[PDB]
Amino acid sequence: CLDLWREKNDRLVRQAKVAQNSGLTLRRQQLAQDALEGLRGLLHSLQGLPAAVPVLPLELTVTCNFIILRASLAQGFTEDQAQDIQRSLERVLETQEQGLRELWDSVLRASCLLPELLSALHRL
Amino acid sequence: ISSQTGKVVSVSGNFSSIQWAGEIENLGMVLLGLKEDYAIWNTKFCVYSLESQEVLSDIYIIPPAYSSVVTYVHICATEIIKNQLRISLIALTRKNQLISFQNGTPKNVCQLPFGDPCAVQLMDSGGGNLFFVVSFISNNACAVWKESFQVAAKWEKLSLVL
Numbered sequence: 001c002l003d004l005w006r007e008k009n010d011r012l013v014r015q016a017k018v019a020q021n022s023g024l025t026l027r028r029q030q031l032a033q034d035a036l037e038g039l040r041g042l043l044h045s046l047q048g049l050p051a052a053v054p055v056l057p058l059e060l061t062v063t064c065n066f067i068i069l070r071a072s073l074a075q076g077f078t079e080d081q082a083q084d085i086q087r088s089l090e091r092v093l094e095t096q097e098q099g100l101r102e103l104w105d106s107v108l109r110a111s112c113l114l115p116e117l118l119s120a121l122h123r124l
Numbered sequence: 125i126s127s128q129t130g131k132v133v134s135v136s137g138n139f140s141s142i143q144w145a146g147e148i149e150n151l152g153m154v155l156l157g158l159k160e161d162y163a164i165w166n167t168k169f170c171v172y173s174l175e176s177q178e179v180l181s182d183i184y185i186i187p188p189a190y191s192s193v194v195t196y197v198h199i200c201a202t203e204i205i206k207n208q209l210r211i212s213l214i215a216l217t218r219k220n221q222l223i224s225f226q227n228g229t230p231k232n233v234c235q236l237p238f239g240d241p242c243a244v245q246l247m248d249s250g251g252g253n254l255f256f257v258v259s260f261i262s263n264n265a266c267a268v269w270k271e272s273f274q275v276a277a278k279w280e281k282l283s284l285v286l
Binding site for chain 2: 048050054
């Protein structure tokens with residue numbers, strides 16, 4: 001199953017890139033928000049499982065891919081993206097509450113335990 | 125206790141929850157549930173042939189990953205490729221999701237608006253307009269498009285639904 005999700009992401013990532021490189025002003029946007037919603041649904045699918053050490057790496061990976069694509073199409077950030085980050089962070093901690101700053105402090109100590117996801121975290 | 129028996133029988137196997145039950149082709153009577161990590165064939169959700177018979181299947185049900193969050197289940201077709209078997213089955217979660225499965229292959233997930241969904245029926249309503257109709261404990265109900273796991277209506281207060 002992790003296979004499939006990984007697979008769907010990767011697929012959607014390439015879809016995204018192809019729209020970027022190629023295309024018409026319309027068809028670009030078509031495939032873009034297509035892949036956006038794809039990432040949503042994959043987001044929601046994993047957002048539906050408890051914590052899952054093996055899934056985390058992808059989870060965080062995924063949401064990044066979203067925010068990036070989301071915000072880039074929007075051509076501007078919003079705070080929905082901060083909440084997405086808040087959520088994923090809270091999940092990370094639930095594996096091992098208050099505000100973003102203590103979360104991060106507790107987060108980077110839980111990562112200094114060296115679970116192998118740091119590639120995403122510095123990305124976050 | 126059945127009609128045709130009239131007697132108080134005990135279920136031999138030692139279960140937690142009984143999400144789904146009912147008669148299927150070739151089997152006569154069946155229960156879903158469990159006894160007491162991402163492998164599709166592992167599943168943790170035992171079928172049970174009724175009348176203290178064999179488990180009958182521990183093969184291609186929902187992953188044990190979902191076993192911690194699902195509360196209710198509703199089957200929509202049952203195939204038999206060999207001694208094995210293949211179910212397209214809907215579940216739903218404590219986390220306000222409605223899911224599609226095919227051989228314990230999760231596809232086409234929807235996100236429920238309301239909190240704590242309770243049960244689901246199917247509405248046909250003709251040519252290409254097919255719906256799962258989902259109840260909640262909160263006296264509210266959904267009807268989600270099939271095809272596209274995609275909410276169609278979200279009524280509220282709903283003493284009852286038929």
